[PDB]
Design a protein around this ligand. Structure first.
Ligand SMILES: *C(=N)CNC(=O)CNC(=O)c1ccc(OC)c(C(=O)C(C)(C)c2cc(Cl)cc(Cl)c2)c1
Lengths: 11, 204
């Protein structure tokens, strides 16, 4: 698969 | 040249995403608003009016407050704006305000390409991810039977001759996947493989 990146995003 | 919304909706239903799919869209995909449910979608980077540029896959995981953005190229947000004029904050905002109690989420995106620079299979790699998603939504980018078959290489390497074999091997297997998994693929194999070819951009 692929590596990946996870950010918390507040709205 | 490329792949059409009709053909990706077919391929996506064939993959088992029928109960979770929200249709293919242009860049103005409204997001995940209907309710808090396992949902995924295919989203173009341009408007319908441009006749179509690049396929992305989106998925929402209700169990984990997480939206996955899948670009087979694994471009950055900035590189998404830059190359494709594509943004998707409007879309994430509408999805958070709707589904997130605290108005927050996790957006998780690929940092690697599985696609050759001149390939026109994007739409199809999107299909493949979505299968992975709808079966393993907790672990879809990597570490699951479907995406395991692909081999990520860092997006920073997209244009390098060292990873061309690798992105080609990726295409051949993608085709095998869709061959093994999709009646609509097998019925139009020869054609889709010509239109989505590993170097379609060179032969326009
Ligand atoms: C990936 N690397 C580039 N590959 C692509 O396939 C991009 N192709 C398209 O976007 C595309 C091609 C042909 C076509 O119809 C003959 C379509 C569409 O169905 C249209 C133009 C109607 C469409 C465009 C957009 Cl932006 C969204 C949707 Cl849902 C449909 C698309």
């Amino acid at each position: 698969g692929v590596k990946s990146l996870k950010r918390r995003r507040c709205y | 040249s490329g792949s059409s919304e009709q053909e990706l909706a077919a391929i996506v239903r064939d993959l088992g995403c029928g109960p979770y799919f929200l249709g293919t869209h242009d860049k103005r995909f409204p997001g995940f608003l209907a309710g808090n449910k396992l949902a995924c979608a295919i989203v173009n980077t341009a408007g319908r009016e441009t006749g179509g540029v690049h396929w992305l896959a989106f998925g929402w995981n209700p169990r984990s407050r997480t939206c996955y953005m899948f670009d087979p190229f694994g471009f950055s947000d900035r590189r998404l704006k830059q190359i494709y004029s594509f943004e998707y904050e409007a879309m994430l905002r509408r999805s958070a305000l709707a589904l997130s109690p605290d108005r927050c989420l996790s957006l998780e995106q690929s940092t690697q390409t599985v696609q050759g620079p001149d390939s026109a299979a994007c739409g199809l790699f999107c299909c493949m991810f979505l299968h992975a998603f709808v079966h393993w939504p907790d672990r879809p980018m990597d570490g699951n039977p479907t995406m395991n078959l692909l081999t990520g290489v860092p997006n920073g390497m997209l244009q390098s001759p060292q990873v061309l074999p690798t992105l080609r091997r990726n295409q051949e297997k993608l085709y095998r996947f869709l061959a093994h998994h999709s009646p609509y693929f097998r019925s139009h194999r020869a054609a889709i493989e010509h239109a989505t070819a590993f170097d379609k951009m060179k032969q326009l």
